[PDB]
Ligand binder design. Structure first.
Ligand SMILES: Nc1nc2c(ncn2[C@@H]2O[C@H](COP(=O)(O)OP(=O)(O)OP(=O)(O)O)[C@@H](O)[C@H]2O)c(=O)[nH]1
Ligand SMILES: Nc1ncnc2c1ncn2[C@@H]1O[C@H](COP(=O)(O)OP(=O)(O)CP(=O)(O)O)[C@@H](O)[C@H]1O
Ligand SMILES: Cc1nc2ccc(F)cc2n1-c1nc(N)c(F)c(Nc2ccc(C(F)(F)F)cc2)n1
Ligand SMILES: Nc1nc2c(ncn2[C@@H]2O[C@H](COP(=O)(O)OP(=O)(O)O)[C@@H](O)[C@H]2O)c(=O)[nH]1
Ligand SMILES: [Ca+2]
Ligand SMILES: [Mg+2]
Ligand SMILES: [Mg+2]
Ligand SMILES: [Mg+2]
Lengths: 53, 337, 424, 437
């Protein structure tokens, strides 16, 4: 039970007690976003083609 | 209408417990993986405790205490007793044991030399398919996770037969952590005389039921199945030793059961948990020449004596299952605490 | 989030008429579209189904379609006839002769474009249109044949919108002509492809409920339509009244439809009293709403499995008892719910009860037992198609036998797809 | 002084955000009109509360917060509620059509169309900051917007604010409150995509908050307002160190330093006590030892799990009220002998303790009674992995049949993202296992 680094201020107090010692780029993001948009666009085209038949 | 699931097909005890449940017209069995269950008779290998108690509107109960393996694994039991102040290394009812990896290698030898130098009983036993020897070199070469323990060189021998035995006690712990000791035990006896100078003849030194059937000279000679119940054993202690089973042995057994279970209660209790646990335990004891009881092992997936499956299995339903899920002279001894 | 309503054919317009008569009463709107309610809860989501005309008059966002004028004249002369937008009556004079080909290919084709003009006009006046709901029967010609034609062309103009139908399935018990199985089989395939949610209303179930439960000797279509309008009111409670859930057709489909083609629901309603003054407890409401006798598809749910279930409780009632009873019916009969969709039962509540009831419960089940309705239609179809009986009515409109063979084939595929998610 | 920008996404994030900023104003003495009479530096200042509130020449204290939802029902309640005066229009972003409980719809379809607008509105707040620390992101796991759009926003934030910290407050789905059958899908999808972008995430299981509201507040059917007021108390206890004078957790970086040794395992468990019903009117005040003891009771945790069967990597105790270091050390010594507390071998067995003397403030007329002292424990324990296990299992049940997958594929997401996300979670579960063996 050791108390270390005790800091005191008007608002409160803090300390430590030891009991025992021991990314994707912007372009890459817009890529996958556009890829998903093209897959939706392709699926919608197939539907419209199906309805045209 | 209560619902339960069965996830351990090999369980003899709970196969009967499930039998009684269905036989009450108020319990229904579900698929193995149906999560809307009140009771789980779970598997003994990686039971998913983390998925219990999250079904809204279902009070869920399971037949195992998460964390009870510390007491039911031979390596864990030694470490639990040595490092638990409630039990202490000076524990008087547990044989001097040492855990060793193929660590307590130098500490086992530390006391070993004292026994060979003083010509004392230097017979030890290695457990985890075991080896009883009187030389450390022979024990360690066999290891190459095991535990080494002093062999009880002066055990109590039943007469006639001059034979060794061990006592199995069944203990049920419910969701309230009440400790119920089944009033009916069993002695698993060996048929052949205890040969103190031949530690290789496992028949006279191992009381296991499987060893006696396929490895014995007079299996079922004195009692059918090499199993003596408390009735005969008590009458024997009276006729032969002028004492009772309660006084000479049962007081120590109840003491040991309480000590072990109360030690781990803070670690496994489900008092304030989102699900409840109970579990049936099997305590194995050893009795020496002076009527001193020693704790051999504890197993959390134990079987029962054929003659006692009915009485004990319904005792489980009444004390552990119906106590949480009602339906509309006790066979257990409540160890108070 | 506006919804555009369409009712097509005799059955569609007579049921649709009663629907608007019912919910117009629940929202306190009189036949002249003038609001005379009591609570602001009535008007909070009024815009989902109604357009607000200048002067604080509310006009249903509904389009009435038929290939003959008889039924829509009786609607315009009916109780709430004046409430509908006059320009939203779109009708021809020839009729469809209970003929799917006439509704879908000949007579209907001649009229469909003008229906789409009215649909487009209503959509343009939507802040954020979310989809459409169509009321129709499948056994006739206009609702079935032209109704499905409409759905196909609506999908073409609004492919990212939700399509929802209340589809009355024919039954020999309550039949007008022998060709109903032909018309229903041709339509069901259209529905498989071109709707997101279809409430299956079996005229057989409606009849049995009127006879057996309501003790109505000699039920009429009017009696049948009372069950349907009451059921349609409950099923749309969330879309019409304030509650935790929003009036969202997409979220409903997202949670109810695990596989695209399996979007055919069994509706139920409770109570159903012959006694009407006695109060129902929450346990009674819950038990009845799950009872087969209270469901409208003439399918035994015990014969299949629930993929998902939606329930609505209306009225002042113990929320705690509701949750308890719902959790009870599940945990007590958990074998009839698929175990590979966790927590597939949703419960909704609404303080405002339907007219004349202290409390009500509506059931919306996506069950694999619905297959026996499609198998029933498929058996009747084949009994006649084996002999090409009555086909000349259809080949005379330009159809050929291959299109019938394909519809039969599509129907049996639908049945087998249900069979694989129940017992292999 | 370094500013913190709060971002609230979807219904859960926005409604919890509303409860938090309400509590902030009460704690800091800021009236609903934004005026703060105790602040004597009008229109400026670098006080601790300025990390969350900017100031205008007129003396209005404006939260450094952005609200984002794809439908305007929820956010319209902010711009018309008690604290409508605090926020200006640019801080509230509403779309027309929501994500319909669909991660893919929120991430790909709708996310792509509004991400730039959100980032621009955020950039506006950042421009007011002299030394931006980073962001606090509130959102649900289960909602289409909370899951799908948050993951997209977190990616772009890592791109546009690379050196800035990002902390999460995430609402874990519970059927008692659940709104959709597919929430396990959305939870796994958004965790996989957000994992490398979040420095420290505080998970809150609606099941735990729900039960706490029923047992401790005696509320039979807790509402979102009940839940969010209790959640805001926990959030307040966690952010107090950024808004008040102190020496513990004084900037966002310190949260990672003190609570997250391994970066992927950045989900510390929160435990709060005491939660007392306001209908009591005369409750016996719990002591420091008693409230500290309650921090090791599973029934007080923000996520139901058994820390007895895990390993601790760090532990912070955040007290508010009448607490002096002496009583804290006494309670820790007592609890250490009674309870099971195992740390990983490569970490010291200790507690960082912070004390703020101002006792917790409760919203007038709410359900929580005012107490003389309260504590929030932040412990990074492997036991929280039980929550991932539950979630992943429900995922596995549905995905084995591909149930509902067509709704996600229909939005442009590939079916492979399901398996990738699930595989990432399988690794996460394995990371916890190695640590807590
Ligand atoms: N604790 C708490 N949870 C909430 C609240 N609102 C919603 N939730 C939870 O959040 C999940 C649903 O996500 P939402 O945030 O409502 O949905 P969303 O982010 O708005 O996304 P979409 O509506 O699909 O566009 C469910 O699990 C709810 O239980 C709230 O106010 N408090
Ligand atoms: N220290 C010791 N001294 C004397 N005998 C011992 C001993 N340790 C074990 N034995 C004997 O070895 C037998 C088996 O030891 P063990 O504890 O491993 O049983 P077991 O675990 O293999 C089967 P069970 O789970 O039913 O007990 C005991 O029944 C006992 O007779
Ligand atoms: C529009 C509407 N009418 C309803 C009537 C009854 C009802 F229960 C829900 C209703 N919804 C509705 N509206 C929303 N806004 C939703 F988000 C939503 N979600 C939902 C639905 C079903 C399940 C499942 F569990 F059944 F699968 C799960 C989640 N359901
Ligand atoms: N429930 C109900 N069913 C109807 C009604 N009118 C017709 N039907 C059914 O609808 C089918 C006939 O279709 P109908 O709508 O009359 O033909 P349409 O005008 O060409 O669409 C048959 O199955 C009838 O049983 C009605 O008012 N109520
Ligand atoms: Ca200032
Ligand atoms: Mg054993
Ligand atoms: Mg007709
Ligand atoms: Mg939302």
């Amino acid at each position: 039970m050791e108390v270390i680094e005790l800091n005191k201020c008007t608002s409160g107090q803090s300390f430590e007690v030891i009991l025992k010692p021991p990314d994707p780029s912007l372009e890459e993001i817009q890529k996958k976003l556009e890829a998903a948009e093209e897959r939706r666009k392709y699926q919608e085209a197939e539907l419209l083609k199906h309805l045209a038949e | 209408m209560y619902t339960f699931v069965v996830r351990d097909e090999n369980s003899s005890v709970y196969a009967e417990v499930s039998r009684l449940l269905l036989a009450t017209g108020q319990w229904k069995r579900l698929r193995k993986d149906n999560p809307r269950f009140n009771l789980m008779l779970g598997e003994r290998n990686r039971l998913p405790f983390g998925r219990l108690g999250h079904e809204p509107g279902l009070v869920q109960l399971v037949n195992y205490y998460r964390g009870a393996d510390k007491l039911c694994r031979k390596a864990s039991l030694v470490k639990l007793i040595k490092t638990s102040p409630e039990l202490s290394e000076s524990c008087t009812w547990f044989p001097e044991s040492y855990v060793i990896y193929p660590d307590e290698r130098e500490v086992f030898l530390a006391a070993y030399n004292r026994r060979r130098e003083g010509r004392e009983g230097n017979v030890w036993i290695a457990k985890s398919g075991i080896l009883i020897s009187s030389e450390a070199s022979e024990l360690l070469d066999f290891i190459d996770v095991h535990v080494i323990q002093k062999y009880l060189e002066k055990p109590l021998l039943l007469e006639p037969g001059h034979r060794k035995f061990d006592i199995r006690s069944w203990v049920l712990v419910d969701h309230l952590y009440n400790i119920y000791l089944y009033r009916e035990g069993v002695l698993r006896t060996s048929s052949e005389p205890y040969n103190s100078a031949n530690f290789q003849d496992k028949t006279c030194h191992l009381t296991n039921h499987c060893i006696q059937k396929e490895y014995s000279k007079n299996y079922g000679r004195y009692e059918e199945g090499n199993e003596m119940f408390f009735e005969e054993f008590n009458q024997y202690l009276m006729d032969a030793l002028n004492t009772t089973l309660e006084n000479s042995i049962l007081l120590q057994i109840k003491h040991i059961i309480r000590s072990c279970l109360m030690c781990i209660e803070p670690a496994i209790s489900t008092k304030h948990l989102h699900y409840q646990s109970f579990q049936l335990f099997g305590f194995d004891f050893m009795v020496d020449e002076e009527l001193k009881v020693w704790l051999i092992e504890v197993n959390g997936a134990p079987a029962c004596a054929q003659k006692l499956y009915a009485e004990l299995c319904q005792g489980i339903v009444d004390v552990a299952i119906s106590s949480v899920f009602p339906l509309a002279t006790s066979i257990f001894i409540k160890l108070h605490h | 989030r506006e919804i555009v309503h369409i009712q097509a054919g005799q059955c569609g317009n007579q049921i649709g008429a009663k629907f608007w008569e019912v919910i117009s009463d629940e929202h306190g709107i009189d036949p002249t579209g003038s609001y005379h309610g009591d609570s602001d809860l009535q008007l909070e989501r009024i815009n989902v189904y109604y357009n607000e005309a200048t002067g604080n008059k509310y006009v249903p966002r509904a389009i009435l379609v038929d290939l003959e004028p008889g039924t829509m004249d009786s609607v315009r002369s009916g109780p709430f006839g004046q409430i509908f937008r006059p320009d939203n009556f779109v009708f021809g004079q020839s009729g469809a002769g209970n003929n799917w080909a006439k509704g879908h290919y000949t007579e209907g084709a001649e009229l469909v474009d003008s229906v789409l003009d009215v649909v487009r006009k209503e959509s343009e006046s939507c802040d954020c249109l979310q989809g459409f709901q169509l009321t129709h029967s499948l056994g006739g010609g206009t609702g079935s044949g032209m109704g499905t034609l409409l759905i196909s062309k609506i999908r073409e103009e609004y492919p990212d919108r939700i399509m929802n139908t209340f589809s009355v399935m024919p039954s020999p018990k309550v039949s007008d002509t022998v060709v109903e199985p032909y018309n229903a089989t041709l339509s069901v395939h259209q529905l498989v492809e071109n709707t997101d949610e279809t409430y299956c209303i079996d005229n057989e179930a409606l009849y049995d409920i009127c006879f057996r439960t309501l003790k109505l000797t000699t039920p009429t279509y009017g009696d049948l339509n009372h069950l349907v309008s009451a059921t349609m009111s409950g099923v749309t409670t969330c879309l019409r009244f304030p509650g935790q859930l929003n009036a969202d057709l997409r979220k409903l489909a997202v949670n109810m439809v695990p596989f695209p083609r399996l979007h055919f629901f069994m509706p139920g309603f409770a109570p159903l009293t012959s006694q009407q003054y006695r109060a129902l407890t929450v346990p009674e409401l819950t038990q009845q709403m799950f009872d087969s006798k209270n469901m409208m598809a003439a399918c035994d749910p015990r014969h299949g499995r629930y993929l998902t279930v939606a329930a609505i409780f209306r009225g002042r009632m113990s929320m705690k008892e509701v949750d308890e009873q719902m959790l009870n019916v599940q945990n007590k009969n958990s074998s009839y719910f698929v175990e590979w969709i966790p927590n597939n039962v949703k419960t909704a509540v609404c303080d405002i009860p339907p007219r004349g009831l202290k409390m009500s419960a509506t059931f919306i089940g996506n069950s694999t037992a619905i297959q026996e309705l499609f198998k029933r239609i498929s058996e009747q179809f084949t009994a006649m198609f084996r002999r090409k009986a009555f086909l000349h009515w259809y080949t005379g409109e330009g159809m050929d036998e291959m299109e019938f063979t394909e519809a039969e084939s599509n129907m049996n595929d639908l049945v087998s797809e249900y069979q694989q998610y129940q017992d292999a | 002084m370094r500013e913190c920008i709060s971002i609230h996404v979807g219904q859960a994030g926005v409604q919890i955000g509303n409860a938090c900023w309400e509590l902030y104003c009460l704690e800091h003495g800021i009236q609903p009109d934004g005026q703060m009479p105790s602040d004597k530096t009008i229109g400026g200042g670098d006080d601790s509360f300025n990390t969350f509130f900017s100031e205008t020449g007129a003396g209005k204290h404006v939260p450094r917060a952005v609200f984002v939802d794809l439908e305007p029902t929820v956010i319209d309640e902010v711009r018309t509620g008690t604290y409508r005066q605090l926020f200006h229009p640019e801080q509230l972003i509403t779309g027309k059509e929501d994500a319909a409980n669909n991660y893919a719809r929120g991430h790909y379809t709708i996310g792509k169309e509004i991400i730039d607008l959100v980032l621009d509105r955020i950039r506006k707040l950042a421009d007011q900051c002299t030394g931006l620390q980073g962001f606090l992101v509130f959102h649900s796991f289960g909602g289409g917007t909370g899951s799908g759009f948050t993951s997209l926003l977190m990616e772009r934030l890592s791109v546009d604010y690379g050196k800035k910290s990002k902390l999460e407050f995430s609402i874990y789905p519970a059927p008692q409150v659940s709104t959709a059958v597919v929430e396990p899908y959305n939870s796994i999808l958004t965790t996989h995509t957000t994992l490398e972008h979040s420095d420290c995430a505080f998970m809150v299981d609606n099941e735990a908050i729900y039960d706490i509201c029923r047992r401790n507040l005696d509320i039979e059917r807790p509402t979102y307002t009940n839940l969010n007021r209790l959640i805001s108390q926990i959030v307040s206890s966690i952010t107090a160190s950024l808004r008040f004078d102190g020496a513990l957790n004084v900037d966002l970086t310190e949260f990672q330093t003190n609570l997250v040794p391994y970066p992927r395992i950045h989900f510390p468990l929160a435990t709060y006590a005491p939660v007392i019903s306001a209908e009591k009117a005369y409750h016996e005040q719990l002591s420091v030892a008693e409230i500290t003891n309650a921090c090791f009771e599973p029934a007080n945790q923000m996520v139901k799990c058994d820390p007895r069967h895990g390993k601790y990597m760090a532990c912070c105790l955040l007290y508010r009220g009448d607490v002096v270091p002496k009583d804290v050390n006494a309670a820790i010594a007592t609890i250490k002998t009674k309870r099971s507390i195992q740390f990983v071998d490569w970490c010291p067995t200790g507690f960082k303790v912070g004390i703020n003397y101002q006792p917790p403030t409760v919203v007038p007329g709410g359900d929580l009674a005012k107490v003389q002292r309260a504590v929030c424990m932040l412990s990074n324990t492997t036991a929280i992995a039980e929550a991932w296990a539950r979630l992943d299992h429900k995922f596995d049940l549905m995905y084995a049949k591909r149930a509902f997958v067509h709704w996600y594929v229909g939005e442009g997401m590939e079916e492979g993202e399901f398996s990738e996300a699930r595989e990432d979670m399988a690794a996460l579960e394995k990371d916890y296992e190695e640590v807590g063996v």
